[PDB]
Design an enzyme around this catalytic site. Sequence first.
Site, short mmCIF file in Angstrom:
data_model
loop_
_atom_site.label_atom_id
_atom_site.label_comp_id
_atom_site.label_asym_id
_atom_site.label_seq_id
_atom_site.Cartn_x
_atom_site.Cartn_y
_atom_site.Cartn_z
N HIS A 83 0.83 -1.18 0.00
CA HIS A 83 0.00 0.00 0.00
C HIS A 83 0.88 1.25 0.00
CE1 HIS A 83 0.83 -0.23 4.31
NE2 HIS A 83 0.29 0.97 4.48
N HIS A 88 6.17 2.43 3.10
CA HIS A 88 6.29 1.29 2.19
C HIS A 88 6.47 1.73 0.76
CE1 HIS A 88 5.01 -0.70 5.85
NE2 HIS A 88 3.99 0.14 5.89
N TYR A 190 -8.18 4.45 13.58
CA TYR A 190 -9.17 4.65 12.55
C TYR A 190 -10.53 4.67 13.20
CZ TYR A 190 -5.85 3.21 8.72
OH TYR A 190 -4.83 3.09 7.81
#
Length: 266
Positions: A83, A88, A190
Site C-alpha cells: 500500500h 512502504h 481509525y
Amino acid sequence: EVPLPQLRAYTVDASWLQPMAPLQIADHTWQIGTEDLTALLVQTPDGAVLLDGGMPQMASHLLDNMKARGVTPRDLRLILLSHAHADHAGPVAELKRRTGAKVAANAESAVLLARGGSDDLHFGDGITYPPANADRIVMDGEVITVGGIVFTAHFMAGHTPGSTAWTWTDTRNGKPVRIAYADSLSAPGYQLQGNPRYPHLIEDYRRSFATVRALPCDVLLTPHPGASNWDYAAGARAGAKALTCKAYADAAEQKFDGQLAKETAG
Ligand SMILES: CCCc1ccc(Cc2sc(N)nc2C(=O)O)cc1
Ligand SMILES: [Zn+2]
Ligand SMILES: [Zn+2]
C-alpha cells in the site's frame, strides 16, 4: 533568514531503519529492506522486481543491496507495492528516477501514490511523501509474470482502500514455496464505523480477513516484519516462528473486533 531545507526538522530515531544486507527467503526472493520494514527483491533472468521499498531514506540502502545481489539499476524492471503509505512506498519516486523500474499498482494505490500520500483517508496530509506515477494499473486477481515468476494481486482493502496482497511461487528447497506477501490488516486510530470517507470500511476489512485466510500461503511475510512474527534480526531463524495467513488473519480480525468493541462504548 535560514533556508527552506535548513528547517523543517525531522525527528529520526537512530534505531529505526537499521540497515541489513540481503536476508534470503527462497532461491530467488530476498529481503533487502531494513530490519523493521520489508522490501523483497526477487531476481529473474529477464530482470528483477521489488515489492515495497520502505521509507524515503531507504532508497540508497536498497539500491546497494540490489548490487550486493547482482542487480543493476537497468535490471530493476518492476516495482509492486502493498500500500501507498510513506513507510512502504516512500522511495518509489527516487528509485524510478535512478533505475529502469516501472510501478504496477491498482487504481486506488495509484491515486494515493500519485498524490504522495496526501489527503489520507485518516491522517490527512501528515504522512506526505514524494509522489510517483504508476506505469501499469492492475485489476483484482491480475497476473504479472517476469522471467518465469508469476505474481498475482489479491485486493485486501482496509488498511488502505488499495491494500494489495501479492502471491508468487519459486523454488527454494527445490520444491515450490507459495509466498504470500500480505498487506497490513491493522487500523490504527481509525474511526471504523460511520466514517464519511470510507463507509464500507468495516465490510471491507471483514472481506479482507477472509481473503488473507485463503491465500496460497506457504510462507507469509508482512511489510512490517513483526506483523507476522518474523524477526529479520534472527539470521536464518527469521521466519522460524513465522505465522500463517490463517493465523495472521484471525489475529487481525480479533484485534479489529476489539477495536470495534471499544468504539461502540461511549
Ligand atoms: C500497541 C500497538 C502500537 C501499534 C502497532 C502497529 C501499528 C500499525 C502501523 S504503524 C506504521 N508506521 N505502519 C503500520 C501498519 O499498520 O502498516 C500502529 C500502532
Ligand atoms: Zn500503512
Ligand atoms: Zn506501515
